[model samples]
Target: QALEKYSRDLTALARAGKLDPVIGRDTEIRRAIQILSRRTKNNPILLGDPGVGKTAIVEGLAIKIVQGDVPDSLKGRKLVSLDLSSLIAGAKYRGDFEERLKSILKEVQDAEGQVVMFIDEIHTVVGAGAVAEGALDAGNILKPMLARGELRCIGATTVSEYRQFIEKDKALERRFQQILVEQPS
Candidate 1:
């Protein structure tokens, strides 16, 4: 599966019960739930430093999915954490990156709203693969795809990274709803 190849199958991990309990994020997860169930702007960006609950909240949602605690629209959905670095890694061929990228995107779109892409360290995608033919930058290619109310997206980053990445291209940043994860209790 190109999706599993490019991203971590968080849904599988959640069902396997391999993930630890996520605490102190009830409200955060609830908010995410609402955003994810929406018809537009369903993408959510987790902004926080390490240990500030960025990753936890999304995994928190995976837990909900496995438990069937989410809305019917969110239930039985695939949650995949996509790391930009790994997506571009081991590109031994000319179109290796684009091939892998488009394949995953096609799979997601083909899934018909069954996929939720979790972009870890999404900032790395900002200016990536700009040298490719047709200007196939990761952010450029993915921005519009995610902008629609198609598959869900959970983009993660730190506050500093957000400023750097978001300011670098506000157009790309505007597609998501930012949720700041505060200091741990």
Candidate 2:
């Protein structure tokens, strides 16, 4: 329920033209759909330099979904971009961030395959909300759901950041299908 406070309905925004129209990059977008259609390890992490339209590819998918242009498997699914900053902003005590993250994760889990979460600069999840040693960070909390395909996520980060944050965690690394996004030729 509180997740509504942190994420915007990207599909809804696409329907309203609130987001800029995403042009080109159909190849990457299609690959994302292919990954999402899978039953396991369905997360797609987009790797590219900043401003190379990584987020736009997701918006393109939303536009296609809104237009009923996606495959049947993708129909009626909602794409929500989670704001980690907002989730992290007021957690003055230990476990507060984890609680909020878990609540959002629980809500998505309850959605039962209807919600897809997008995390821009997803590298942040690696240590987000971590305040001490042995604390569970966002990546740790997310690993299980992602592994089991209980949560479908679209992640965007630079290639370097991906190597730095996600690659080192074998458990986290295995849960995602990578899509290398080069700047348009």
Candidate 3:
């Protein structure tokens, strides 16, 4: 349950009513599901300004998949929304965060077809834990797993972060499909 230490089981939370009821995001949810339908490069990064409910959009998707509201292609898949803070909080040693992330990735790969990993503020993964000059950050650590399609991720980030962080990493940026979320206002 090491992964549980830093990740939220959004599907489980939705099933248990632990997450808020999500509505009015069906279009975005369906688009996310469509990206997930791809066999490779299936990570969808939801982008928008802060406070525009990007997290809620993902919550909607998590709840829908659990509620049998998605196509059979998406059925039985659970969402693991990772909390980056927890992953980095206790890493006093070098390679600490990397080990945690790699283990989580390994768990998802071993789980095979059952888990969809979610990284909120996915942009931060780019420089996360890069203490040394040009050292491997979380993005670098994650790219190989992403490239092989053993893991599918749902990432949410504000527009500024996407441009400042993810856009700078061409390798990381190309692995994701962008879903621009508009606020209803």
Candidate 4:
């Protein structure tokens, strides 16, 4: 399968010490791999506050995919971590927000296998008062793409932000595969 080829790619790169170690993530990785291998294949979102390794796991997964070392089920998959700040400067109307957002959608839609799009600080992506026109916020811009399954998103947000912001949109809420990343005890 294409997944097997991707796994071989990761394995080849891993042997070269170019990838980050999956330390302290053996169980988590296995669980993710199993779910990805045998289920609807929604990528896991590492949800937690800042400095909690949310981005690290995505990076690690990219390395694995790039090196071709993960399970055959998850090979050839591309993982891209989306930084919304870089996409939107000043405001949505005056900037490249629309273009970047559309580009992201196209990238996801055209992907062959699983493509994980991770959004850090996703609350900012749809915060109230961030509008392009009369009532067209970034959220409005993304609704169609999210609904069409153009991208399978792994949105990382703090518990507080999720409760205070993201959960307000039930439709958007249903689109995500939520996972709580617990802080170290």
TM, every model: 0.85, 0.88, 0.87, 0.68
How many clashes in each candidate? 0, 0, 0, 9
lDDT of 3 by residue, 76-140 (tens): 99888887677666675547778877887788878776888888777666563333555436775
The superposed Cα distance between candidate 3 and the true structure at residue 163, in angstroms, equals 2.2
User: Which pairs, if any, clash in model 1?
Assistant: none
Candidate 2's TM-score: 0.88
Candidate 4 regions exceeding 4 Å error are: 1-19, 34-43, 71-73, 90-96, 126-137
RMSD of each predicted structure: 3.1, 2.6, 2.6, 6.3
Model 1 agreement with the true structure over 13-114: per-residue lDDT tens digits: 999999889988988889888888876667778888887857878888999988999998898898988766666564655377777887888898898878
Q: Which tens-of-lDDT digit does each residue in 1-185 have in candidate 2? A: 68899898899999898888766787888989988898666789999988687888989989888888878778999999998777767575448777888998899989887888998888766563323465435665665666556678899888888887678677677778899988752
lDDT of 2 at 84: 70
| lDDT at 95, model 3 | 75
Question: Distance (Å) between predicted and true CA of 70, model 1?
Answer: 0.8
Superposed Cα RMSD, model 1:
3.1
Ten residues in sequence with the least summed lDDT for candidate 4: 1-10
Error of 2 at 69 (Å): 1.1
What C-alpha lDDT values do all the predictions have? 0.76, 0.80, 0.77, 0.57
Order by TM-score, highest first: 2, 3, 1, 4
Error of 3 at 52 (Å): 0.4
Query: In candidate 2, how many clashes are counted?
Result: 0
Best of the candidates, TM-score: 2
